[PDB]
């Protein structure tokens, strides 16, 4: 009453504790490597279990593992971002740098200026090593006119 050996459809799929033999009532779990998520059809899954049924057939067809996508970075009121990485690619390990509209706005600080670096992490969301998921804050700069009546020069 045995089931076929489990079938990996890509390099990013991991089978936890693979067995030599698989029998009725036994099971296996599929996970992915750091950065990738389980897919079945065009749908994301949180987990995957396949039970070996009494006829010898797995109750479920092996999924795939594909690269996570943190989505479009959130908008930064009075700032913007630029990619340090391939333009418009929001997948695992992608990197952006937020900046404010200077000299009119200035980024809020403290650590210090490897400043608004956000990378698309294993957990599938944009994070900065210090501030985490929360985005930066652009604050009004005071007293620095661009066309002042007097100003210092060298």
């Amino acid at each position: 009453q045995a089931c076929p050996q489990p079938k990996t459809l890509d390099e990013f799929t991991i089978i936890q504790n693979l067995q030599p033999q698989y029998q009725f009532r036994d099971y296996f779990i599929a996970t992915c490597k750091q950065g990738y998520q389980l897919i079945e059809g065009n749908q994301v899954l949180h987990s995957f279990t396949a039970v070996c049924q009494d006829d010898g057939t797995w109750h479920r067809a092996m999924p795939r593992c594909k690269i996570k996508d943190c989505g479009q970075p959130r908008n930064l009121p009075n700032g913007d971002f630029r990619y340090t990485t391939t333009m418009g690619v929001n997948t695992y390990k992608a990197r952006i740098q937020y900046y404010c509209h200077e000299p009119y706005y200035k980024m809020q600080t403290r650590r210090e200026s490897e400043q608004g670096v956000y990378t698309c992490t294993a957990q599938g969301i944009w994070k900065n090593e210090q501030k985490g998921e929360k985005i930066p804050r652009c604050l009004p700069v005071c007293g620095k006119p661009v066309n002042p009546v007097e100003q210092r020069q060298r």
């Binding site: 009075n78 706005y105 009004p140 700069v141 005071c142 007293g143 066309n147 100003q151």
Partner: protein
């Protein structure tokens, strides 16, 4: 402004145009507050919308940019509308319903943090859309005025038998021999000093009162002494 010049776009990016009981000024703080004079909201005689315009030097173009609705008003508790020679606490704060987007022609001014901003002879600027010596102004103007000796200001009033309140929460600028002064329509704009150590611009005062306009001393609400109050009102 009497005896001044046309401001250029960007010279005084915090400058604000009000039209409440007539023409007045203000200065932007942060991106949604406006500092001005109480008597602009609550005049001495009078016995009235909050029309506020920002972001340009030409009055017609200020108005085309559009009004900025006011959500909350804070007048300082010490202002007394109904006494007539007492401008104590002539300071007030307008909060915008919506924050403005900053740009080259629209930036706030800083607040002062020490008393050296009121040193004898320190030069500051007052900009305004007020009346000129012989015509109405349709564009922002400014003059450059020296901080004055408060003892001499007192002496000058003593000389005219004036009983006006001249407190420690006011200072004086200009000089009786100078043509340069604020005038009708300039009240509520700031006296602005460029810190020489810093290159940053600071609102040391608010155009408040005088005896007429030219060739006298002008009196300004001493902004330094209300900074704690400004910040508290700015934090609701």
């Amino acid at each position: 402004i009497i005896g001044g010049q046309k401001a250029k776009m960007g010279n005084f990016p915090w400058q604000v145009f009000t039209n409440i009981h007539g023409r007045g000024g203000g200065a932007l703080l942060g991106d949604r507050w406006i500092l001005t004079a109480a008597h602009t909201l609550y005049p001495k005689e009078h016995e009235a919308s909050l029309d506020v315009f920002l972001g340009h030097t030409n009055v017609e173009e200020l108005m085309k940019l559009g009004n900025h609705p006011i959500r909350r008003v804070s007048v300082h508790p010490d202002y007394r509308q109904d006494e007539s020679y007492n401008f104590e606490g002539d300071i007030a704060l307008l909060e915008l319903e919506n924050s403005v987007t900053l740009g080259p022609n629209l930036l706030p001014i800083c607040l002062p943090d020490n008393d050296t901003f009121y040193d004898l002879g320190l030069m500051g600027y007052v900009s305004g859309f007020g009346v000129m010596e012989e015509k109405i102004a349709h564009d922002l103007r400014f003059v450059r005025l020296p901080v004055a000796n408060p003892q001499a200001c007192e002496n000058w009033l003593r000389g005219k038998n004036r009983m006006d309140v001249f407190s420690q929460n006011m200072f004086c600028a200009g000089h009786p021999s100078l043509k340069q002064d604020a005038c009708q329509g300039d009240s509520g704009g700031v006296f602005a000093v460029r810190d020489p150590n810093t290159d940053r611009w600071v609102a040391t005062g608010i155009v408040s009162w005088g005896i007429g306009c030219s060739r006298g001393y002008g009196f300004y609400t001493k902004v330094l002494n209300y900074v704690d109050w400004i910040k508290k009102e700015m934090e609701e």
